[PDB]
Design a protein around this nucleic acid. Structure first.
Ligand SMILES: Nc1ncnc2c1ncn2[C@@H]1O[C@H](COP(=O)(O)OP(=O)(O)NP(=O)(O)O)[C@@H](O)[C@H]1O
Ligand SMILES: Nc1ncnc2c1ncn2[C@@H]1O[C@H](COP(=O)(O)OP(=O)(O)NP(=O)(O)O)[C@@H](O)[C@H]1O
Ligand SMILES: [Mg+2]
Ligand SMILES: [Mg+2]
Lengths: 452, 375, 59
DNA sequence: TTTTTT
């Protein structure tokens, strides 16, 4: 009776909710928290005891009576609620930061946006300013990794766009590759991003690319649920022998809003994908099969500034893989680990988000960077497909080797082989030409652009 | 004794039932629910407390006595009643909608049809009309994905019949393949379907078609129990080196009314197959064994419209696999995610059902669409 | 009970069943044939009936 | 008991 009344006033505050996945989220310390192995509901009961009248607060000091109140609470929670539906809100440990504005909400204002994830650190408005003498050093670091030159113009913009999208709690349709040689600043960029978003950043394994995602317990993919930034590192030169290729099957799966995969000792097979997936590379990736659906999901950022020791500087100024060579800063790595640039980089990310990802958040691919897509890109501009616009032109097509078969358009295999040998040699694309012939095999409905 | 009379009175209202599989289904808030990891019987005991007499209601406020009532109820439940025997009913969170007429039943009327699953959302009879601009916008979306042209007439009809089959809860004799190239609208159709039926829609992994099911817990199979639509997206290019060529025996099991599979920490191994299984494909399927039984189990719906960007428009118009080229809507996935077209696509599905699947529901195969079946 | 190309080429789904059916024989694994004869492998109570489309070849 | 292991 008395412990039933206490449980009712707790649900009157809407401080505990039931989610569609069966989790009980609680509102403690200005944040929605959930944990499958922690007593969070009884934690809320003890914390909320100050907002109760005098006769009710004294009965919440007994752990046994807090379990009775908790048992009452779980019986009254019959309907689920939707959580994490605002993509333009950045949730901290003590509130939610609006990204369309610079406003910070802490209290009942941040409760409306049921963000069950958070960075894990309290937001500091005294460091989220602009001037911030650490911000000068951060500008020095960023302007070295991605120089502000005319040559590094579209690459710098892509770099800013990709890092900014890690603040958006929506589904991202592209996978970005951080490509560069050694000592170029990719790991520095990763460590700066991890310092700025905290627990919203997760580091995952290499399986999520090169193996099936649903073959039993796969914690390496179930840990990406509601994470806004996923990093994979150091693909082991898949173009060489003894390697498993990228398996473009997973590339399309990782783009979908829902990724199938379950943790250990649980049946939750659906995870929500809000993550910008970035892979650090020293070599360009190679895929098992190249498809137009694969070239629509790949972007590449190039790192071309080398940070070297004074001894081996001259060996780096004569390398074609570097555009600039700079002194390595030995204390920079330890300063990032101490979250010195935690809020300056966050201010940078918010500014870039306002510049790029408003009002529509979307990541666009760069097919012209991957060498594996060169054949498909060339064929896309080399051939016209079938018919309809060419039937009246067949009078002029009697010459130039064009013949008629099946009454649409045809080309003999030998004719097409000889013609395609005149645009690019088979030294590097011989297997590619053979694969195209086999996949589109005899007659070939394809017309050259110059013969129109 | 008093807690035994409370349990008997609760049992007299037929709000707790036992299923042949072993589930305990409760009637809370105009919907049958079952869950093996949630105190659903105690939730009903607390909620039903307003219908019991005055002296019996105070005894139900103590949690410890509610587990006593629950134990009494679980001991009383010896019989077992069949569930989900109406294939033309759409269960919502606040009632059941008839798919033959337009009547919506809420309350004790919806209780007769023991629909243990639900869409998960409430039925709002304000957008379920035909009018309002959501329908006009949606009809443009559908008419661009599958144009009303005469050459697409049979394909458009097969598209309508397959989607409307997700409304009917029964065993479907065909597995439909959604075939098309990139930016053809297959995932848009899937996302429209998910918002329309909600919890009656589940996505499963690739092991339901390529891997032997009988090993340990199989949540990817146990989650298809009573679901009316199962999507398995991203069919890989098995016609290459190092791949698994689906499985012809799985299709036989996936067409059977009973599917074997158990969850984690659970003994329930029988699942009822009520789902229209659709696979999102950029490549048409191949199989290890091509039998005669496999012939009447596969249907193919082809998407031939490209939603390109202004930059890459000229190249798209010179492609064989595209019949029309349109403009991609950047702010359309957000509208679908916010469930804007939830009750308009639902009305479209209901109309297609009334036109196609009454009074007989059946799906026909299209083997003259796969190169393998030609021989 | 119905089962295809698994038992010949489900231990729980063979117990006390009075009949077990196998279909469309796609060798036949005579070692598996000898196993189903013994009462204990669960207990065998099923007249395991096979229907074929073409004349089968043993190993 | 599931996972781990086969
Ligand atoms: N702006 C900078 N000025 C000076 N040193 C820097 C700067 N940015 C990064 N460094 C340092 O340069 C070193 C190499 O950078 P690092 O982050 O390791 O790039 P990397 O690409 O991950 N190396 P690798 O893994 O071989 O590709 C580290 O010790 C960094 O602390
Ligand atoms: N009728 C439409 N009008 C405008 N844009 C549309 C329409 N239908 C779909 N789109 C958009 O077109 C894009 C591609 O659609 P999508 O659902 O991804 O097709 P898809 O075939 O599944 N992609 P893929 O996996 O490569 O085959 C998405 O951004 C959709 O929002
Ligand atoms: Mg590194
Ligand atoms: Mg898709």
């Amino acid at each position: 009776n008395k412990l039933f009344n206490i449980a009712q006033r707790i649900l009157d505050t809407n401080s505990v909710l039931l989610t569609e996945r069966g989790d009980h989220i609680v509102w403690i310390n200005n944040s929605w928290k959930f944990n499958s192995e922690e007593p969070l509901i009884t934690k809320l009961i003890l914390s909320i005891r100050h907002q109760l009248p005098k006769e009710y607060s004294s009965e919440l000091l007994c752990p046994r009576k807090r379990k009775t109140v908790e048992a009452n609470i779980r019986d009254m929670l019959v309907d689920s609620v939707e959580t994490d539906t605002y993509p333009d809100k950045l949730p901290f440990k003590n509130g939610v930061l609006d990204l369309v504005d610079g406003m910070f909400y802490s209290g009942d204002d941040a409760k409306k946006y049921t963000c069950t994830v958070s960075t894990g650190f309290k937001f500091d408005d005294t460091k989220f300013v602009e001037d911030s003498p650490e911000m000068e050093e951060l500008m020095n670091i960023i302007n070295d990794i991605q120089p502000l030159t005319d040559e590094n113009k579209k690459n710098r913009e892509l770099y800013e766009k990709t890092l900014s999208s890690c603040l958006c709690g929506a589904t991202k349709g592209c996978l970005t590759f951080f490509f560069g040689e050694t000592a170029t600043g990719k790991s520095t960029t990763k460590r700066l991003l991890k310092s700025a978003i905290g627990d919203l950043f997760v580091e995952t394994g290499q399986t999520i690319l090169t193996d099936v995602l649903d073959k039993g317990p796969n914690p390496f993919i179930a840990n990406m649920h509601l994470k806004r930034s996923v990093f994979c590192s150091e693909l082991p030169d898949f173009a060489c022998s003894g390697s498993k290729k990228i398996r473009s099957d997973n590339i399309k799966k990782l783009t979908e809003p829902c990724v199938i995969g379950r943790p250990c000792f649980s049946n939750k097979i659906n995870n929500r994908n809000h993550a910008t997936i970035i892979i650090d590379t020293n070599y360009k990736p190679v895929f098992d099969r190249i498809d137009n659906a694969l070239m629509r999901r790949i972007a590449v950022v190039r790192f071309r500034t080398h940070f070297s020791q004074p001894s081996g500087r001259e060996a780096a100024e004569n390398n074609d893989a570097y555009d600039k060579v700079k002194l390595l800063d030995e204390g920079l790595d330890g300063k990032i680990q101490n979250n010195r640039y935690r809020f300056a980089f966050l201010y940078l990310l918010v500014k870039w988000y306002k510049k790029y990802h408003i009002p529509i958040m979307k990541l666009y691919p760069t097919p012209e960077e991957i060498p594996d897509f060169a054949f498909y890109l060339k064929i896309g501009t080399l051939l016209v497909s079938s018919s309809v616009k060419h039937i009246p032109l067949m009078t002029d097509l009697s010459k130039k080797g064009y013949i008629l078969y099946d009454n649409v358009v045809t080309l003999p295999l030998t004719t097409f082989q000889q013609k395609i040998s005149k645009y690019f040699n088979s030294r590097l694309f011989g297997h590619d030409i053979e694969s195209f012939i086999n996949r589109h095999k005899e007659y070939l409905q394809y017309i050259f652009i110059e013969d129109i």
